[PDB]
């Protein structure tokens, strides 16, 4: 709930941009990728 207002499609482009290893963004994976985007940005 830190990367809210961002669509699943924008979260994906952001995973790609930061070279974060990922699969699709779906309901059961959303929180995990938001945490990985946070861990990345905060380093």
């Amino acid at each position: 709930d830190n990367y809210a207002d961002l669509s699943d499609t924008e979260l994906t482009t952001l995973l790609r941009r930061y070279n974060i290893p990922h699969g699709p963004v779906v309901g059961s994976t959303r929180r995990l990728y938001e945490k990985k985007i946070f861990e990345y940005e905060i380093q």
Partner: protein, 87 residues
């Protein structure tokens, strides 16, 4: 029943692409691949976390990949039939 439907439910899916699944045409396949669903097992994964629910899966395929009613109907039917035979 179609050729694509018959060939998909006849055997384990293994490493088959998204396009091998019934209802997944050129457009719908290109969009699923753009969302990260390169393989048909990734779509089966979504279907399994959605607990094989028809309404939740078909509304998901529509919302995220722009699937029409015929496409979502055909994709769900193939996965349901496949899970009943191989899972």
């Amino acid at each position: 029943t179609s050729q694509k439907h018959r060939d998909f439910v006849a055997e384990p899916m293994g490493e088959k692409p998204v396009g091998s699944l019934a209802g997944i045409g050129e457009v719908l396949g290109k969009k699923l691949e753009e969302r990260g669903f390169d393989k048909a097992y990734v779509v089966l994964g979504q279907f399994l976390v959605l607990k094989k629910d028809e309404d939740l899966f078909r509304e998901w395929l529509k919302d995220t990949a722009g699937a029409n009613a015929k496409q979502s109907r055909d994709a769900f039917g193939a996965l349901r039939e496949w899970a009943d035979a191989f899972l």
